[PDB]
Amino acid sequence: TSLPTSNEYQNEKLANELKSLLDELNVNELATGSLNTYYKRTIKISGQKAMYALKSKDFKKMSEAKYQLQKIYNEIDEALKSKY
């Protein structure tokens, strides 16, 4: 068959990246349960942004939500290591 065209493959790569973080979203939202209220407030706000971005397929919102969800994930990772 013919190979995929210019942007179809690129848009799929971005979506796969967002789907990956969404799979562990319920885990991270749960992980903040024992953390401070800053995280619980931050992640549920960042969570919907990614959820809406995926079903809307908006490149602008999918890109930002990816890095927005990635940052709060890193904040949780450092929080759990320093909490022990």
Partner 1 sequence: KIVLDPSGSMNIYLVLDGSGSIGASNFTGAKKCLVNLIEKVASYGVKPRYGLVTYATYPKIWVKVSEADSSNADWVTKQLNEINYEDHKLKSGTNTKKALQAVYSMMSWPDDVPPEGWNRTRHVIILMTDGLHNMGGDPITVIDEIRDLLYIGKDRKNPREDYLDVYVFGVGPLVNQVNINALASKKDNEQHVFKVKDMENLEDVFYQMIDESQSLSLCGMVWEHRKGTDYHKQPWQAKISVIRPSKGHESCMGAVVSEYFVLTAAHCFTVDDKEHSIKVSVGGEKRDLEIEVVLFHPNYNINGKKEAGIPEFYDYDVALIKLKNKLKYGQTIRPICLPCTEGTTRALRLPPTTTCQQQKEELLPAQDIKALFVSEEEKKLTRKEVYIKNGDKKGSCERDAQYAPGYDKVKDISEVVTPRFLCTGGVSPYADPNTCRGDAGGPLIVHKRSRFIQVGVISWGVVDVCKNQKRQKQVPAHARDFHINLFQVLPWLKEKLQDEDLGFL
Partner 2 sequence: LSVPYVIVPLKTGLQEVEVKAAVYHHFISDGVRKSLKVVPEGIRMNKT
Partner 3 sequence: EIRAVLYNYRQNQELKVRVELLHNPAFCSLATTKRRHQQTVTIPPKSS
Looking only at residues 38 through 57 of this chain, which bind partner 2 when binding is defined by CB under 8 A?
A: 45, 48-49, 52
Neighbouring residues of 75: CB distance < 8 A, sequence distance ≥ 6: 39, 42
Among 1, 6, 37, 82, which residue interacts with partner 3 (rule: CB under 8 A)? Answer: 6
d(CA 76, CA 15): 23
Among 4, 19, 20, 36, which residue interacts with partner 1 (rule: CB under 8 A)? Answer: 36
Looking only at residues 38 through 67 of this chain, which bind partner 3 when binding is defined by CB under 8 A?
A: 59-60, 63-64, 67
List strand residue ranges (DSSP E) for 10-81, in order.
Answer: none
Interface residue list for partner 1 (CB under 8 A): 24, 26-28, 30-31, 33-37, 76-77, 80, 84
Interface residue list for partner 2 (CB under 8 A): 45, 48-49, 52, 61, 65
